[PDB]
UniProtKB/Swiss-Prot annotation:
Subsequent cleavage after Lys-125 leads to alpha-trypsin. Further cleavage after Lys-170 yields pseudotrypsin. A cleavage may also occur after Arg-99. Belongs to the peptidase S1 family. It comes from the Eukaryota. This is Serine protease 1. Binds 1 Ca(2+) ion per subunit. The lineage of its organism: Eukaryota, Metazoa, Chordata, Craniata, Vertebrata. The active site is at 40 (charge relay system), 84 (charge relay system), 177 (charge relay system). Substrate binds at residues 171-172, 174-175, 177. Its cofactor is Ca(2+). PANTHER family: RIKEN CDNA 2210010C04 GENE, TRYPSIN-RELATED. GO terms for cellular component: extracellular space; serine protease inhibitor complex. It catalyses: Preferential cleavage: Arg-|-Xaa, Lys-|-Xaa.
């Protein structure tokens, strides 16, 4: 997260870290057996780490659980990043408590100007590299689709929205990939892509989760 703040330990209790020997992507817990993250975070051999704040120190509230199956969206296009969403089922159900909680799926899409919270353990510098050990948070608005498509001509589909700041300096970044964008208590977005991080006139692009609720609900029920 570039230009955000330290969240505070376990204040985003639905945030998941995907680990394959190291942290490489974020995710969101949507019920005790299922996680949603981005398709561009697919790997074989994922362990889902719940209850995390410092990902380098075991602090007492973590649950480490291996994925039993991963389902990448049937129409994910890795070149356009269109339909960038994947479901991960846990080998055993997480124990929900104050520090491990699920987030609700949206009943409708959010409008431009709604304020959201984005969170992740990804890169914190726009020019350079510095990876945090504790969860970073950023408050950011959904932007008009006009300013989203003018920043990226011909690349935005109906399954994508922009959120952030056109002046730059505040954005999600690699390492935040697959993580939550929550607006009004609902999971509205997944950290998907952008041009670098926190560059002027190049906002973050996010998977528009409200287009996918039927596929999510039908797939978790049959798996
Ligand atoms: Ca930890």
């Amino acid at each position: 997260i570039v230009g955000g703040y330290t969240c505070g330990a376990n204040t985003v209790p639905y945030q998941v870290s995907l680990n394959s020997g190291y942290h490489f992507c974020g995710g969101s817990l949507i019920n005790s057996q299922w996680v949603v993250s981005a398709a561009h975070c697919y790997k074989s051999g994922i362990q889902v780490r719940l209850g995390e704040d410092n990902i380098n120190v075991v602090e007492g509230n973590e649950q480490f659980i291996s994925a039993s199956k991963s389902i990448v969206h049937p129409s994910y296009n890795s070149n356009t990043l269109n339909n960038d969403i994947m479901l991960i089922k846990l080998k055993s159900a997480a124990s929900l408590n104050s520090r491990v909680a699920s987030i609700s799926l949206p009943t409708s899409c959010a409008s431009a100007g709604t304020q959201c919270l984005i969170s992740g353990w990804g890169n914190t510098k726009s020019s350079g590299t510095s990876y945090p050990d504790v969860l970073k948070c950023l408050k950011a608005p959904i932007l008009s689709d006009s300013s989203c498509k003018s920043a990226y001509p011909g690349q935005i589909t109906s399954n994508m929205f922009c959120a952030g700041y056109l002046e730059g300096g505040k954005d999600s970044c690699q390492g935040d990939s697959g993580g939550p964008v929550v607006c009004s208590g609902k999971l509205q977005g997944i950290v998907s892509w952008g041009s670098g991080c926190a560059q002027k006139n190049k906002p973050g692009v996010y998977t528009k989760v409200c287009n996918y609720v039927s596929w999510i609900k039908q797939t978790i029920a049959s798996n």
